[PDB]
Amino acid sequence: MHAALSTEVVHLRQRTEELLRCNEQQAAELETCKEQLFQSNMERKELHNTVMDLRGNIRVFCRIRPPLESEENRMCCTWTYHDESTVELQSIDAQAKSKMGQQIFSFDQVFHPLSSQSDIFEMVSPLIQSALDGYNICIFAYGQSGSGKTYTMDGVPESVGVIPRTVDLLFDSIRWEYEIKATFLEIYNEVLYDLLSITEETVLDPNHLRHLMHTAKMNRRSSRSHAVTKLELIGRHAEISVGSINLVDLAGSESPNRSLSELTNVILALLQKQDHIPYRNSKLTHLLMPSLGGNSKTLMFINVSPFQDCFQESVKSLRFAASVNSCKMTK
Amino acid sequence: MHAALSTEVVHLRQRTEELLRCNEQQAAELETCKEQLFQSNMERKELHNTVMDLRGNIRVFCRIRPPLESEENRMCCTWTYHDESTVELQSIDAGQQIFSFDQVFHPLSSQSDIFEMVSPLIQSALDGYNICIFAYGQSGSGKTYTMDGVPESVGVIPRTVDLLFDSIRGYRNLGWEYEIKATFLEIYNEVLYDLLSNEQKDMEIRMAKNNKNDIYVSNITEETVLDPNHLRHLMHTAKMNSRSHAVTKLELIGRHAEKQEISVGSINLVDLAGSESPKTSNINRSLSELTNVILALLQKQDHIPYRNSKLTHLLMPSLGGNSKTLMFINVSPFQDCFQESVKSLRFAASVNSCK
Ligand SMILES: Nc1ncnc2c1ncn2[C@@H]1O[C@H](COP(=O)(O)OP(=O)(O)O)[C@@H](O)[C@H]1O
Ligand SMILES: Nc1ncnc2c1ncn2[C@@H]1O[C@H](COP(=O)(O)OP(=O)(O)O)[C@@H](O)[C@H]1O
Ligand SMILES: [Mg+2]
Ligand SMILES: [Mg+2]
């Protein structure tokens, strides 16, 4: 019995130890693997930005939101992702899939419904920073109501969002003298509201802005209005670099008041009709003019719903998103 | 005590079991992380190649060298750098001379400046692309100092290698193992010469083994670099060995055991012979043949006569397709080199002339 037991003890001891060093071996590799994956991710993004710049074409991002717990029984259409920038959608009924069929679109980046509010911002960040270095950055969220425009731009108190993570980046990148001119307005019928037509107030502290913004979001079928938000920056250091971080939140061009229809006519003009562009044919287009044409980095979000009942609309959205990413921004 | 050993056996089993599961869980993590790293690297390579395409798959640069300390008063012609792409020159003792490049390096541009144009292509070579770094110009323009450089200021090749080993080291953290095939040769009068041997012989350019498109130089010395010391040794052995072309080829062969993937690319650092006009008591063919192959590639042609010159045949698998080429046109900042400097630069005109 002694011998036998002895044999076990020895065996298990070697196994325990040989198995222990193996655990360390992996941990070392796991640790290293993360670092490398992290370095790889960082590279792709730097390169993804270099690429989008040299291209010139206004950046277009697709964001596909996940279904809310409420609509737990709401049918979804088939979604295929060919890679980081190409997304396809197919209807539940095959009688439409054969007749024209091939609903595949390719943008600068497609966000899966699992994407977080950070995975989004991390792609917008570069623009926000370039604002300080003297650049006019614009960014809106086209899409049908219920798609995610407001959730992307503003977001929810629980999580966050573009606009407000933007401030945490607008000040952090300052830590040279920087003066900021916050601005809020809205367009229901075709008139401007809030503190404007007239002006704004200056930013003082991150809290003051994080508040000034919350102040505006108050006083808000229901949302067929564009939510713009200007943010002029001032570079002194002591000739004065100036850049604005425009933030627009479109209404929704879903199957129907119709200002968005004039925005598309702009996009089309950004290619053909090089002669007179319908910039001055919409109160929205006018404020977004220094973005669609003039030297300015424009980033648009294309919010879409994964629901079948939204198919026709998703396609209209995706389809319009394609032409926009075709405009070669002068810059 | 049997009981004592008996109790240790149970606890050792509990420990082993609890250990087995910990390791198993780490395996699942590791595999996933490895799977994501490879894909992530695959997209990074794609993104990198896009940037190179955008900057141009065939770029031409100008590099004017500073006046030599061996002549304070030998004349310089009237230079005038219009932008960082255009440059002009003018004679003093006998239209307009204005040429555009992807970038113009003046006499103050350092070797690092030059390498900043190449550095990105080393990554391209490790990602399976074939690069061609060319140094065109008349004797004295600065071709050698550019490509090889000097010990006080190493040139393209030495920097390329240094970057190469560092990047190769890093890649091991992704599961990649890299090997470098080095070959050094000289082309004088359409005749190749091995710079790694003393034995006079014959080396013909035959088709590769795994591809009727790749090249193969029979009787060539193909060293498999063991480490930077080995390579260092070779490069020195080779320099020790005018009117010919010098070609230092680095073949980057990466292997990924786990994914069973390979990545084969190559850097072709060429030191073209002088482009001047000969006298009495030719190479200017393998040279014109080279510029034409680059011009032919630009105009996107079909029937390219690579096999025309010994050089264009050798670099054939690196002059077309995904391949990237940098043409550093060296120039002498002197009046007596006006005609030639204009000739050298004039090539840039033909390059961008391709609408
Ligand atoms: N990406 C997302 N992840 C989680 N929830 C989202 C996401 N996008 C939108 N939502 C939620 O979906 C609903 C519609 O979003 P919302 O921004 O109001 O659509 P829109 O503003 O385009 O009409 C809201 O209930 C919102 O809080
Ligand atoms: N950028 C430079 N800086 C300092 N010296 C240079 C530079 N370019 C060329 N030279 C020098 O000019 C001379 C010309 O030789 P080289 O560069 O090999 O010319 P080539 O290859 O065109 O025949 C060499 O002595 C070299 O060291
Ligand atoms: Mg809304
Ligand atoms: Mg030389």
Residue numbers in the entry:
A (entry chain B): 292 to 466, 473 to 494, 517 to 539, 549 to 566, 570 to 587, 600 to 674
B (entry chain A): 292 to 385, 392 to 538, 551 to 590, 598 to 671
Relevant lines from the article:
Motor proteins of the kinesin family hydrolyze ATP and use the energy released by nucleotide hydrolysis to move along microtubules, performing essential roles in transport, division and other cellular processes. The kinesin-14 motors include Ncd, a motor that plays an essential role in spindle assembly in Drosophila oocytes and functions in the spindle and at the poles in early embryos. Structural studies revealed that Ncd differs from kinesin-1 in that the conserved motor domain or head is joined directly to the α-helical coiled-coil stalk, rather than containing a 'neck linker' between the head and stalk. Ncd, by contrast, is a nonprocessive motor that undergoes a single displacement along a microtubule, then releases from the microtubule, although the motor has been reported to move processively under certain in vitro conditions.
